Design a protein around this motif. Structure first.
Motif, mmCIF file in Angstrom:
data_model
loop_
_atom_site.group_PDB
_atom_site.id
_atom_site.type_symbol
_atom_site.label_atom_id
_atom_site.label_comp_id
_atom_site.label_asym_id
_atom_site.label_seq_id
_atom_site.Cartn_x
_atom_site.Cartn_y
_atom_site.Cartn_z
ATOM 1 N N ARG A 27 -11.742 -3.027 9.153
ATOM 2 C CA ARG A 27 -10.456 -2.401 9.407
ATOM 3 C C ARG A 27 -9.267 -3.158 8.838
ATOM 4 O O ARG A 27 -9.404 -4.259 8.300
ATOM 5 N N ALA A 28 -8.105 -2.523 8.974
ATOM 6 C CA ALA A 28 -6.824 -3.022 8.513
ATOM 7 C C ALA A 28 -6.682 -4.528 8.444
ATOM 8 O O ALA A 28 -6.883 -5.135 7.395
ATOM 9 N N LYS B 125 -1.474 -6.923 -9.163
ATOM 10 C CA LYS B 125 -0.345 -5.999 -9.136
ATOM 11 C C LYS B 125 -0.073 -5.430 -10.527
ATOM 12 O O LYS B 125 1.070 -5.418 -10.991
ATOM 13 N N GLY B 157 0.729 0.164 -2.629
ATOM 14 C CA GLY B 157 0.799 0.117 -1.181
ATOM 15 C C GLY B 157 -0.308 0.889 -0.492
ATOM 16 O O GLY B 157 -0.957 0.392 0.438
ATOM 17 N N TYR B 160 -3.435 -0.899 -0.998
ATOM 18 C CA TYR B 160 -3.464 -2.166 -0.290
ATOM 19 C C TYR B 160 -3.770 -2.028 1.191
ATOM 20 O O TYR B 160 -4.463 -2.862 1.757
ATOM 21 N N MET B 161 -3.253 -0.989 1.831
ATOM 22 C CA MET B 161 -3.502 -0.831 3.246
ATOM 23 C C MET B 161 -3.216 0.569 3.767
ATOM 24 O O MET B 161 -3.893 1.049 4.686
ATOM 25 N N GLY B 162 -2.210 1.221 3.191
ATOM 26 C CA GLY B 162 -1.847 2.555 3.641
ATOM 27 C C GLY B 162 -3.011 3.502 3.864
ATOM 28 O O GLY B 162 -3.146 4.107 4.930
ATOM 29 N N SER B 164 -6.392 2.916 4.150
ATOM 30 C CA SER B 164 -7.311 2.490 5.206
ATOM 31 C C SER B 164 -6.776 2.777 6.612
ATOM 32 O O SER B 164 -7.550 2.927 7.554
ATOM 33 N N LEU B 165 -5.456 2.832 6.764
ATOM 34 C CA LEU B 165 -4.868 3.133 8.061
ATOM 35 C C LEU B 165 -4.855 4.640 8.272
ATOM 36 O O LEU B 165 -5.187 5.138 9.349
ATOM 37 N N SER C 81 3.272 -6.282 0.331
ATOM 38 C CA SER C 81 2.660 -5.209 -0.437
ATOM 39 C C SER C 81 2.588 -3.872 0.289
ATOM 40 O O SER C 81 1.959 -2.942 -0.208
ATOM 41 N N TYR C 82 3.231 -3.771 1.454
ATOM 42 C CA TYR C 82 3.236 -2.528 2.234
ATOM 43 C C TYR C 82 4.297 -2.608 3.332
ATOM 44 O O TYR C 82 3.976 -2.750 4.508
ATOM 45 N N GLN C 83 5.564 -2.513 2.924
ATOM 46 C CA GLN C 83 6.712 -2.596 3.828
ATOM 47 C C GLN C 83 6.715 -1.668 5.033
ATOM 48 O O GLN C 83 7.507 -0.744 5.086
#
Ligand SMILES: *[C@@H]1O[C@H](CO)[C@@H](O)[C@H](O)[C@H]1NC(C)=O
Ligand SMILES: *[C@@H]1O[C@H](CO)[C@@H](O)[C@H](O)[C@H]1NC(C)=O
Ligand SMILES: *[C@@H]1O[C@H](CO)[C@@H](O)[C@H](O)[C@H]1NC(C)=O
Ligand SMILES: *[C@@H]1O[C@H](CO)[C@@H](O)[C@H](O)[C@H]1NC(C)=O
Ligand SMILES: *[C@@H]1O[C@H](CO)[C@@H](O)[C@H](O)[C@H]1NC(C)=O
Ligand SMILES: *[C@@H]1O[C@H](CO)[C@@H](O)[C@H](O)[C@H]1NC(C)=O
Ligand SMILES: *[C@@H]1O[C@H](CO)[C@@H](O)[C@H](O)[C@H]1NC(C)=O
Ligand SMILES: *[C@@H]1O[C@H](CO)[C@@H](O)[C@H](O)[C@H]1NC(C)=O
Ligand SMILES: *[C@@H]1O[C@H](CO)[C@@H](O)[C@H](O)[C@H]1NC(C)=O
Lengths: 152, 299, 152, 152, 299, 299
Positions: A27-28, B125, B157, B160-162, B164-165, C81-83
């Motif tokens: 996860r995150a 990047k 972004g 990077y994580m967006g 997966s959330l 990398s993700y604000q």
């Protein structure tokens, strides 16, 4: 990027597994690196050393049950040289002090528990972070239920 | 589970550049958007009834930044077509993530009608060639571009994580409205393609979430116990492709089997004598986090 | 004396800022060194790495309010990398179980919350330690409200 | 086996000392190595440095007392350059919200408290982990009451 | 905010040695103590009505250890006067702390009617010369002294942490009974003192808590954004003085402006060509934790 | 407090091999087991009334794995008797732990009627010679043995942690049913055995828990304060024996004094001129965690 080289792990509770406490690292902002393994729902240490072990669970219940309910959170070690759960860290919490919903209303209750300490571990040791009432486990939000270790 | 975003601009017949966007959760279409030539902006043509976009904070706003991408991709396609040795019919931005059993990751790459072009790396990047051929540093592909900062933010972004959330919000809202999980049947066969010595074939039968990944590992590495240990390291006999497993572009012999919601897969391996333990098949799928399967000769 | 060389910080709540939770490092046993900055009330990591993040808040209330009151403490990460604020650690606590002062008496209540875990951070990340009811913040004593991180 | 070389200690409460909170290191998974000493019931740091300090106590009470009872847990530092207890970490908890056993029943209650943070310490500093109501100390299980420090 | 302790013994005209002690919170007198020659011990002559000494656990007991200091300082002054090249009218023990905006620190030094003598360092646990001249190792100034252990404890302890803890108790009890905080007006001017090339003048107008500190930093170090980041490092064009900023002995051109509780400051700087960015003025005060101010030529 | 397990097989007169097991908490017999030749397995002959084995989770099951040990030890004794230069009447497995004042540890070694044989080290996970003579690598003493894995688990585990956990359960159930704790009287005498220069004699009088340990440390190491600091390091003038203090085999001059439950001890030391501070006697006992005692000449 080198996470660091130190065995480390920060696993979180799987919300898709209602009724139980299953740890995941996919996860995150979770971790499972440099040797530590997540096997049979337990973290396994890859080397001799001092480790910081910690865990947090968040209990939630709608109104109050009967008599009295006890919530326990505990981290166990089952050593390679002594295959038996021995408690390292443990706490108890009594949510409903027998209040029991009179018959009208009964709001929800939240009760968190944190555990943490430093320990000498052997390569191969298994660490467990368990609770007694997984039916009250609130893993709806995100960083509410976790278990991790870092080699210091 | 799987979350895939597909942005595509095409030169179509003669004239304008068409643009479409698809949002797929597993094999379920969630959103379709196309460029309206009259209005000059995108329109949502389809939206799954079970997906309340308000309950998915991490799904990009502005209709997935469609106008932004359409325009920037249109620009990129035009530049790409100037060097007549690259000229292409269309351009696609493939980005998304996955949680296939124990495995998990995200991707973001740009492919052409001629094949994979460039892959975006979260670490560096910047984009990196997916083929020996290289890729033209134009449009959304170079730091030189005035909108690069937006590319980094929107694409980088998300990757990077967006994503997966977000994928977790889709899962919640999909729970009851899509095909139920279905555990496959696995069998590894040790046939033999004549010219070469031995051949191993791992076949996974009718599993639901269509995403499946397979790893071939020499049995020696399982030191007697045939269980794949999560955090443990394993050398793995990589496959050869311009795509990395996980990216929708990876070649998996999957077919949606007969009148049903389930899928089937067949993975073959050249048992060259280079090894020294005979690989065992490790199957990664939502049902059975990760199981190991053996035997050759024909089991 | 070399604090160590490791980026570290242990900031504490400002008691002179009633009604809000403002962190300061200009006190007795507090820290803000080797690169980490305290900007816009958030700690800013100076380098890639594994970090131990932790925080504690102490809530206090005189008697009980109406209906039900929820207390939340949470540490967020807004990555370079993700604000966007994404929760790393969070807990909830229900002080007044709707008891509400019958009409005579109503003693005070104290409720502490601890949060802590290890995380992979990027140079430039911003960490926040926030609460939802700063009006119940008890920062009268001293080591009752803190927020810190140490690079492991 | 080298515990690590880092001064460290994880002491636990002595159950054979009813009514008080006495720390010991001569048990199962406890520690007292590389210089730190346990003197007059306090841990003594052997060198300049950044230290992770932590402690947990578990309070337990049968039914409810009178008026109101307050439980406090606090870790103090008495520096070599300023011989006086100064609080580093502290928390308060109110178990019985004056409920007081009506006259029939009165179940038991459990209340845990965790404390932890990073601090700059001088060689010779003395750390104390004290409570105000040792008569409610539940050290029956095992990893329910501990106090430790590790040099980071 | 500021907390200052001043102990002073004087040879007065001909005879006895007088002793006084002052406790100042900001510019507010909190306690005055003087040596009673009849009784042979100190007496509290003044005590601010708002200060309940019982609520300030970290304010030294025994009337600030007055008898101890008076006596030991009297001894020190006598020894100092034996070498006729040091002979002085009085001796002072200046110790205290401050929380000026983001800046904070503590001090403890001994000065003579002739100027600063020795500064006590918490680290080394000993006194250090404040001037090239050096200081006579006598009285309370040498480890040789039988009471050194008490000096370390009383002076060293207070400076190490005692004061920083106490200052907070004063603040609590002072809240409503003293001048309210008042934010200053700042302007930096680029005049020019003729012989030299350029001169910068930072002027801070009417601020309440009288403690103000100023830092001159080359603008290059702010990489475009003119905000002073708390934990960030900054080279700073130090000033030249035997005192360190923070110690009451540091020369700040402050004057209590016209009939009011507020104060004003004027700080000048020699813009020698040694630099390469032209300094910017950073003002540290209770109001505005730390603000940056620019422009020269005259702004 | 003390917990000791003693397993012993003997060749007895002519014929069979007898087997016995004793469980001792302090000097209190808790369990006795002997090998029944008719039945061919062990039988519990004695069980202390105060010990509820169900409340002691860490006391080995299967009657302390008696059949396992009896059999494996019988095998080991037979092998040992083949090399006629080792032939022995019996074999014993001594394992247990202790909490003597501040000191604490565990042990597990094998001794013969001829004396100590091999000691099991938790770290190396193997046996180590206790005498220069060495030990025959046969039976339960070699990794070669098919049951070695069980030895590691039963003996190694107990010694690694099992015992230290179990001893606490015994203590709980023993609380009221055994001799109460009794603090001793200590006196150190500086006699002199004629040929040698000086001799020190530490005598501890009538203490209950029979376990007592003594450490002789040069007084210089106490830098003026005669208190033994828990975690502090101390060089200690080791004694000479094949056993390590803590193991029941260590030679302590203890005798159960006259009609009573208490015990007495006398420890002597050769004050050779090698030293340079004259040792002081440090006594470790349950009462008085660790006290220091001085004086010579005869005090
Ligand atoms: C994206 O969509 C286009 C047209 O809808 C399709 O041809 C292409 O295969 C898709 N790309 C991928 C890899 O999903
Ligand atoms: C999603 O749709 C529901 C109606 O089914 C609406 O009530 C809700 O506000 C929308 N999003 C949410 C949960 O905020
Ligand atoms: C693009 O076109 C140029 C001619 O302008 C040619 O030199 C170049 O090789 C082409 N791109 C590649 C490397 O295929
Ligand atoms: C200390 O007090 C004396 C006498 O009141 C005074 O002359 C001296 O200037 C004071 N020093 C400081 C720095 O306050
Ligand atoms: C300060 O003065 C008050 C009276 O105003 C007195 O009752 C108190 O004991 C003193 N300090 C405190 C608050 O304990
Ligand atoms: C102190 O007096 C002596 C004369 O005995 C002189 O030599 C010395 O230089 C004086 N102090 C200093 C170093 O100025
Ligand atoms: C073990 O038991 C045997 C037989 O009862 C006995 O002779 C021997 O002294 C005991 N050994 C120890 C170390 O207690
Ligand atoms: C030990 O014996 C008691 C009575 O002596 C019995 O009731 C108990 O169940 C046994 N062990 C326990 C406490 O489980
Ligand atoms: C064991 O017997 C052998 C000969 O059988 C002999 O050489 C050896 O010395 C004996 N054991 C030892 C090493 O003492």
């Amino acid at each position: 990027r080198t996470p660091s080289d130190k065995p480390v792990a920060h696993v979180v509770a799987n919300p898709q597994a209602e009724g139980q406490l299953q740890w995941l690292n996919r996860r995150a902002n979770a971790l499972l690196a440099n040797g530590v393994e997540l096997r049979d729902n337990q973290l396994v240490v890859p080397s001799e050393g001092l480790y910081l072990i910690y865990s947090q669970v968040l209990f939630k219940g709608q109104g109050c049950p009967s008599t009295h309910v006890l919530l326990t959170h505990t981290i166990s070690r089952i050593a390679v040289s002594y295959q038996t759960k021995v408690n390292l860290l443990s706490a108890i919490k009594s949510p409903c002090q027998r209040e029991t919903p009179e018959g009208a209303e009964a709001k929800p209750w939240y009760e968190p528990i944190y555990l943490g300490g430093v320990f000498q571990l052997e390569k191969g040791d298994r660490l467990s972070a368990e609770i007694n009432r997984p039916d009250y486990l609130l893993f709806a939000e995100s960083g509410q239920v976790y278990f991790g270790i870092i080699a210091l | 589970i799987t979350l895939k975003y597909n942005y595509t601009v095409t030169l179509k017949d003669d004239g304008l550049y068409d643009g479409v966007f698809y949002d797929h959760y597993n094999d379920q279409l969630v959103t379709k958007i196309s460029y309206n030539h009259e209005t000059r902006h995108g329109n949502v043509n389809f939206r799954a009834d079970w997906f309340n976009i308000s309950r998915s904070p991490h799904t990009p706003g502005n209709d997935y930044n469609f106008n932004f991408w359409y325009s920037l991709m249109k620009e990129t396609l035009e530049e790409i077509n100037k060097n007549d040795s690259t000229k292409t019919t269309s351009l696609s931005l493939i980005t998304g993530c996955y949680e296939t059993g124990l495995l998990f990751g995200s991707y973001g790459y740009v492919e052409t009608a001629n094949g994979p072009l460039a892959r975006y790396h979260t670490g560096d990047k910047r984009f990196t060639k997916m083929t020996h051929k290289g890729f033209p540093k134009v449009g959304m592909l170079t730091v030189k571009n005035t909108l690069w900062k937006d590319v980094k933010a929107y694409l980088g972004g998300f990757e990077y994580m967006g994503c997966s959330l977000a994928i977790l919000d889709y899962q919640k809202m999909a729970k009851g409205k899509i095909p139920k999980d279905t555990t496959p049947t696995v069998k590894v066969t040790g046939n033999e393609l004549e010219d070469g010595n031995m051949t191993l074939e791992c076949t996974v039968n009718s599993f639901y979430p269509p995403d499946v990944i397979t790893k071939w590992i020499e049995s020696e590495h399982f030191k007697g116990e045939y269980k794949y240990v999560n955090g443990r390291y394993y050398p793995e006999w990589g496959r050869k492709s311009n795509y990395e497993p996980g990216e929708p572009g990876f070649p998996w012999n999957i077919k949606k089997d007969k009148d049903a919601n389930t899928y089937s897969l067949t993975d073959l391996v050249r048992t060259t004598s280079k090894m020294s333990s005979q690989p065992v098949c490790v199957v990664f799928h939502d049902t059975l986090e990760a199981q190991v399967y053996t035997c050759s000769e024909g089991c």
